[PDB]
Design a protein around this nucleic acid. Sequence first.
RNA 1: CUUUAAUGUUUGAUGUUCUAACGUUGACCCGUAAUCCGGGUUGCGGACAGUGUCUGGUGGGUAGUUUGACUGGGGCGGUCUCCUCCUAAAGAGUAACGGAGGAGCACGAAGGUUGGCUAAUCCUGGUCGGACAUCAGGAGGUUAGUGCAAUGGCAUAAGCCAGCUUGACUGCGAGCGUGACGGCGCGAGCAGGUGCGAAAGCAGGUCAUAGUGAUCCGGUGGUUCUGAAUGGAAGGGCCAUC
RNA 2: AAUUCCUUGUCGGGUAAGUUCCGACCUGCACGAAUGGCGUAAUGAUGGCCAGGCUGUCUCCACCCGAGACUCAGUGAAAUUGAACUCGCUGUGAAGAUGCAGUGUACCCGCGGCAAGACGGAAAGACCCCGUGAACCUUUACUAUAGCUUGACACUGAACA
RNA 3: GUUUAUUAAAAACACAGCACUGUGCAAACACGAAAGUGGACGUAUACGGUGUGACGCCUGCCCGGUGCCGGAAGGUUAAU
RNA 4: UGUAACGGGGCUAAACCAUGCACCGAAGCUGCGGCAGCGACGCUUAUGCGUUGUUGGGUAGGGGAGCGUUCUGUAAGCCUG
RNA 5: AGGACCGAACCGACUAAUGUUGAAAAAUUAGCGGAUGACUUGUGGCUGGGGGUGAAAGGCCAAUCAAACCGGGAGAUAGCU
RNA 6: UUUUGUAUAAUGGGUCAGCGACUUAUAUUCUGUAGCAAGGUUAACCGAAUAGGGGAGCCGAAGGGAAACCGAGUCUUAACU
Lengths: 51, 76, 96, 64
Amino acid sequence: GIREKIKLVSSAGTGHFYTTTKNKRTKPEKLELKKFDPVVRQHVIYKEAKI
Amino acid sequence: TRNGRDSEAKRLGVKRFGGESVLAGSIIVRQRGTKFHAGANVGCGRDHTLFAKADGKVKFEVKGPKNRKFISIEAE
Amino acid sequence: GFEGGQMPLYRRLPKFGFTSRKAAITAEIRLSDLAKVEGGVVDLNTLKAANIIGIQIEFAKVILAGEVTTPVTVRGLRVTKGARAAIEAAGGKIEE
Amino acid sequence: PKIKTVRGAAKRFKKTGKGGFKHKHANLRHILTKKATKRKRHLRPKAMVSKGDLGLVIACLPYA
RNA sequence: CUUUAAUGUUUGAUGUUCUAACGUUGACCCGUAAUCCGGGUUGCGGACAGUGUCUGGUGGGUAGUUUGACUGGGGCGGUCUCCUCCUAAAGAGUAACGGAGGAGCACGAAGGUUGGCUAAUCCUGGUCGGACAUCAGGAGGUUAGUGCAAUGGCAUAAGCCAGCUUGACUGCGAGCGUGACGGCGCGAGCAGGUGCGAAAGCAGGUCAUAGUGAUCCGGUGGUUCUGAAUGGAAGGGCCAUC
RNA sequence: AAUUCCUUGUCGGGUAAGUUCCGACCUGCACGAAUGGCGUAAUGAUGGCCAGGCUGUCUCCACCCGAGACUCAGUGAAAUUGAACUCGCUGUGAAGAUGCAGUGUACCCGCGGCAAGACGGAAAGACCCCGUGAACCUUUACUAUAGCUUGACACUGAACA
RNA sequence: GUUUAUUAAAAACACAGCACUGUGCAAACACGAAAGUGGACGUAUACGGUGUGACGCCUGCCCGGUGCCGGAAGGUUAAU
RNA sequence: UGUAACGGGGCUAAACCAUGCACCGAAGCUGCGGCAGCGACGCUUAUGCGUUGUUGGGUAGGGGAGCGUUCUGUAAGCCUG
RNA sequence: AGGACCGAACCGACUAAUGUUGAAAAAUUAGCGGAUGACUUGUGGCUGGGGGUGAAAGGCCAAUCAAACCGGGAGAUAGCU
RNA sequence: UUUUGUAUAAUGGGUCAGCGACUUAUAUUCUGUAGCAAGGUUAACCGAAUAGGGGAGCCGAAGGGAAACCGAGUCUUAACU
Ligand SMILES: [Mg+2]
Ligand SMILES: [Mg+2]
Ligand SMILES: [Mg+2]
Ligand SMILES: [Mg+2]
Ligand SMILES: [Mg+2]
Ligand SMILES: [Mg+2]
Ligand SMILES: [Mg+2]
Ligand SMILES: [Mg+2]
Ligand SMILES: [Mg+2]
Ligand SMILES: [Mg+2]
Ligand SMILES: [Mg+2]
Ligand SMILES: [Mg+2]
Ligand SMILES: [Mg+2]
Ligand SMILES: [Mg+2]
Ligand SMILES: [Mg+2]
Ligand SMILES: [Mg+2]
Ligand SMILES: [Mg+2]
Ligand SMILES: [Mg+2]
Ligand SMILES: [Mg+2]
Ligand SMILES: [Mg+2]
Ligand SMILES: [Mg+2]
Ligand SMILES: [Mg+2]
Ligand SMILES: [Mg+2]
Ligand SMILES: [Mg+2]
Ligand SMILES: [Mg+2]
Ligand SMILES: [Mg+2]
Ligand SMILES: [Mg+2]
Ligand SMILES: [Mg+2]
Ligand SMILES: [Mg+2]
Ligand SMILES: [Mg+2]
Ligand SMILES: [Mg+2]
Ligand SMILES: [Mg+2]
Ligand SMILES: [Mg+2]
Ligand SMILES: [Mg+2]
Ligand SMILES: [Mg+2]
Ligand SMILES: [Mg+2]
Ligand SMILES: [Mg+2]
Ligand SMILES: [Mg+2]
Ligand SMILES: [Mg+2]
Ligand SMILES: [Mg+2]
Ligand SMILES: [Mg+2]
Ligand SMILES: [Mg+2]
Ligand SMILES: [Mg+2]
Ligand SMILES: [Mg+2]
Ligand SMILES: [Mg+2]
């Protein structure tokens, strides 16, 4: 209703991304999470970007 | 205000009864809470589905100080 | 295909794939085909002449199907691992 | 005259070695973010047409 | 060059005239004993008007159609997908415009793990303080709590806190449940890589069950696929997503 | 009230008695000024109401004259029709019976009459609903379009500021 | 006066009269892809469209809505 | 509309309750004769026959086996003033 | 003088009875309205089907007009009988 | 005939005789049957004309994968217990 779709992008060269949602009002900063990148086959930091 | 509504039935209940031989992985009971608890060689899934973790025979028991119901699996 | 009005099965489900124009000028050859060519030399031309592959085929593969009981010289054809073993067992020759 | 292929069927089913048909799963086109990764994993591989539906598909693909 | 004016030029902008395209449903001549037409003369206009192609607006004047179903007839009202309970006859399922309610979201913590903790309500005492705030004891024993309806669960808590964190992982999946189907669900275990814990271990989101939209067409990123003479490219496929 | 639901409003007049009529009141469900308001002599095969005359309209029907009906002779149709040896009652029953059960009644066949029944005849109900039927009509339903209108380019040129 | 020839003759249509409104004449308007024609061999005391309906006494208030008329500054806006 | 609320006559049981034995009563069951479907096995299978258990109501509908009509061949044959 | 008055012809068609397998697919009888007018009528002409014409009733356009008649698309389509 | 159900007062037929409704073409699949069999069969056309010629083609003996491609395997995935 207010909760927007965002994509978390792999900080490695790969263009791999996870997709999730966010309340942009209450949480205006960039969501940042270690996740598994299946292309370099390792856990790497992932950073919000626009869907 | 107005009535006239209901939801699809979820087909919960016991799928394998006492004595029945099952292969590992087989669902033994679908339930909404833990009316039945997982006993030996039986696992509890996220919707409280009890399933076989081993090939064998389904076994219902009542155990412990609270007289709870447990489903386990006996090797056959 | 009509199902009464319900979105039918061939619309319910998604399309997939594309068609390879290359597959259509690519043929497979059986071991049983190698003796059927006049000259003990198997090429694209030879196989065409013996009516084993189509006239417009530009690539062919000898596969392990049937058997070969005569020495053959295959040439300009791809050959499967198995087929190469079978062709050579019967005294044959493969070459690019 | 020749029977005509239902051409939209022919873009969704392919005949396999024993005469059944393989097809692509529904629900993996869009509205994906909310769908579990597990669920989507199991929709990737192709699947076989069911017994109830073979009559319909075969009727649509007389030259398959 | 600092700057300024004015004669010479391209394209416009605007205007004033001109005549020669074009208009004449003014007068006249001939074809011609003709209120048509054509040619010619003359007057009046004149690059306007008008027409062609394109284009915005208007357009029931004309045209082709749409304008749902359920329903104790139809119409009005209500309803249409999904979740919970009862009807439902102690396995599953089970109808009515039967009886009651709820959803079309929320949450980067309200997720994971380790470690810890334990409600409601009542009695008595206590500054302001009251029937009820916060404090102490006692009874009580989960009647509380669970983001939200209901039902089933929940103390080993699934309820409540803190530390560290990203398993709200990627590839798969023995075996099952539920479906006419499309589908939907549960799942130990396997490989890679990760968090928490001394360790056994736990984690593939949230106590569970609602919170949803097939296909087509199209967009964005990726790509050991394809690439209409050949090398590219466009477009297509595949994977991710809108 | 060609308009008033409540309504036969209420009051007055006419009648022995008047849901209509006329006159008045105003509480106008829901009059009103060229969608014209209110009047209006004359006109009217126009609507409502009253009276005189008149009468078979009626109380209540009688008699009579003629054309049919009836009989004889000649000609000679029709609608309809599964088959009929084609009664009443009460009950039963696709729920309103000549045909079923029980029972009553009835010798066989015409002719003149009557219309209670044969859910009598005639027309594949026009009401009502249904069909993803048809048509015509309306509009600020949708999509188009003639027409009307805008501007660009073409037919379309020159001189001068 | 007219009308549903064949179930309605009427209170319906028409009507003289009134008003609004278009129309400068190659008129507006109408039939016509056009040519041609009606309007009209007429010319605003004329012609068309709309409403009202002899006559008498008269015809009040409302321009927010919808329709129409007028406007050029600003915004938006087509082909090109 | 007419007895019309035992079907009627009529019944004091020809009603009701209890016990008992008899009998009537169907296309059910038995008996005699017969046909066929499916099995099975026989005296003995070139495939029907012979024994033998059993089955044989049927709409929509599926299956199986046939009759007859017209025309072509068989047929310049065969029947027919 | 007059879309003046009464009233035949002529034009119409207000009421009733009859008729309704009729004498008649709209009439007959008794009555009725207009009758110098926006009257009536003969002959010939013109207007054509989304078209005409209409003192306007969706009236009329060759005995059924909210889209004539004939031929064609044509075996339209008919989830109905 | 239609129906849950029709003596039905539901439909249809006055009667008789003649006619009157699941066809035909081409595709496709299955069954039966016949031929040949890892092969089977030709089409137009030629023709010596129901022969013979014609094997252009088509189906089948190979699949998996979207495809490249690999191939009794293949795809899935970095790889599969
Ligand atoms: Mg070939
Ligand atoms: Mg996609
Ligand atoms: Mg111009
Ligand atoms: Mg245009
Ligand atoms: Mg419009
Ligand atoms: Mg329309
Ligand atoms: Mg159409
Ligand atoms: Mg309905
Ligand atoms: Mg139950
Ligand atoms: Mg039960
Ligand atoms: Mg929680
Ligand atoms: Mg703990
Ligand atoms: Mg206290
Ligand atoms: Mg550690
Ligand atoms: Mg692109
Ligand atoms: Mg090219
Ligand atoms: Mg190229
Ligand atoms: Mg009186
Ligand atoms: Mg009065
Ligand atoms: Mg008059
Ligand atoms: Mg007499
Ligand atoms: Mg006689
Ligand atoms: Mg009868
Ligand atoms: Mg009748
Ligand atoms: Mg009918
Ligand atoms: Mg009439
Ligand atoms: Mg009349
Ligand atoms: Mg008027
Ligand atoms: Mg006014
Ligand atoms: Mg304006
Ligand atoms: Mg008696
Ligand atoms: Mg006895
Ligand atoms: Mg007997
Ligand atoms: Mg018997
Ligand atoms: Mg007169
Ligand atoms: Mg008369
Ligand atoms: Mg007169
Ligand atoms: Mg005439
Ligand atoms: Mg046609
Ligand atoms: Mg027809
Ligand atoms: Mg019925
Ligand atoms: Mg009966
Ligand atoms: Mg009958
Ligand atoms: Mg009949
Ligand atoms: Mg007959």
